[PDB]
From a paper:
Interestingly, DrBRCC36 adopted the analogous homodimer configuration involving the MPN domain (buried SA = 1693 Å2) displayed by the CfBRCC36-KIAA0157ΔC heterodimer (B for stereo view and combined sequence alignment), with the main exception that the CCHB helices α4 and α5 were completely disordered. Additionally, a major portion of Ins-1 was disordered and the ordered portion (helix α2) was shifted relative to the corresponding position in CfBRCC36. Both of these structural distortions may be attributable to the loss of supporting interactions afforded by heterodimerization of CfBRCC36 with CfKIAA0157, as follows: Firstly, in the active heterodimer structure, a productive conformation of CfBRCC36 Ins-1 appears supported by direct contacts to CfBRCC36 helix α4, including between the invariant Arg53 (Ins-1) and Asp186 (α4) side chains and between the backbone carbonyl of Arg53 (Ins-1) and the invariant Glu183 (α4) side chain.
BRCC36 is the catalytic subunit responsible for the majority of K63-Ub specific DUB activity in the cytoplasm and in the nucleus as part of two distinct macromolecular assemblies characterized by the presence of either of the MPN− pseudo DUB proteins KIAA0157 or Abraxas. The Abraxas complex (ARISC) functions in DNA repair and breast cancer suppression, while the BRCC36 isopeptidase complex (BRISC) promotes interferon dependent responses by deubiquitinating and stabilizing the type I interferon receptor, IFNAR1. BRCC36 consists of a functional metalloprotease JAMM/MPN+ domain followed by a predicted coiled coil region implicated in protein-protein interactions. KIAA0157 and Abraxas are required for the catalytic function of BRCC36 in both complexes, and enable association of two additional shared subunits (BRCC45 and MERIT40) to each holoenzyme.
Numbering used by the authors:
A (entry chain A), B (entry chain A): 1 to 24, 27 to 51, 59 to 146, 151 to 164
Write the structure that this text describes.
Amino acid sequence: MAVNAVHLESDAFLVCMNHALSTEEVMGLCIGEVDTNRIVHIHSVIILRRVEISPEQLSAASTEAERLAEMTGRPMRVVGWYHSHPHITVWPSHVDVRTQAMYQMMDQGFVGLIFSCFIEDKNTKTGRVLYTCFQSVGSEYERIEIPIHVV
Amino acid sequence: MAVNAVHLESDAFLVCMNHALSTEEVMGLCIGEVDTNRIVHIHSVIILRRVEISPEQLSAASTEAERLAEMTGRPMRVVGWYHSHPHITVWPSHVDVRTQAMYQMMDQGFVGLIFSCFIEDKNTKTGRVLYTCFQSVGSEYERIEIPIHVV
Ligand SMILES: [Zn+2]
Ligand SMILES: [Zn+2]
């Protein structure tokens, strides 16, 4: 079992929350660290528009990794990826599962993260936001949920 | 200081050594882990032919990351990149420094690794192989050597 849990610091949570409400095609970059107990600490999340990473994406990631490392004193890095599900259920689409899968070909403890304000019940007057953390598992891959906590 | 030292297990060393002798354009992928003391453990190295990673490169990396994690029990990942300097000095070319620099925009503790059997003295009868570990540091980037040990 690669990752036991994911500790998401409250500020990075609020960022994902704010974009989950956007309700509009982008993807986020989770930045933080991993400790002895296979726990992924996410201190910040940056949201921007085979495996390829644009120089625009690199500079944004590096800038926050600098700001975080300068704050904490510890070295930071990209540990996960975020995107929103405003028009579908919070669960990872089969594309997300196959995407996360090839991400794990590099970090193996890499993490998939999804927020969703979507509600199919069109008669309820009650607000809802879901957030799940997932990975991937011959033959096809499938979702495996990772416990996620907020600090 | 992102990384204190690099612990390179003896078998991964021999691999880099074997290709350093090839004397012939490829690049290697260092696979391992990082611990509390900012030490990069490299358990294996795979050598194959903006930031882009081919699906051919991904499958190779994942396969060894599986084999290592199955052996050690701990989760593995890509921690560095290797290439040989058979026709130049062991020191990182300015391209290597700029390459390593944008690698660090993702991992920050990511490591550059170079082996070299090159000897400019054409009158000496004595064999030599150098290996250095480096990173990158507004304005231009420059080489910063990382201590490297073999297990
Ligand atoms: Zn999706
Ligand atoms: Zn070079």
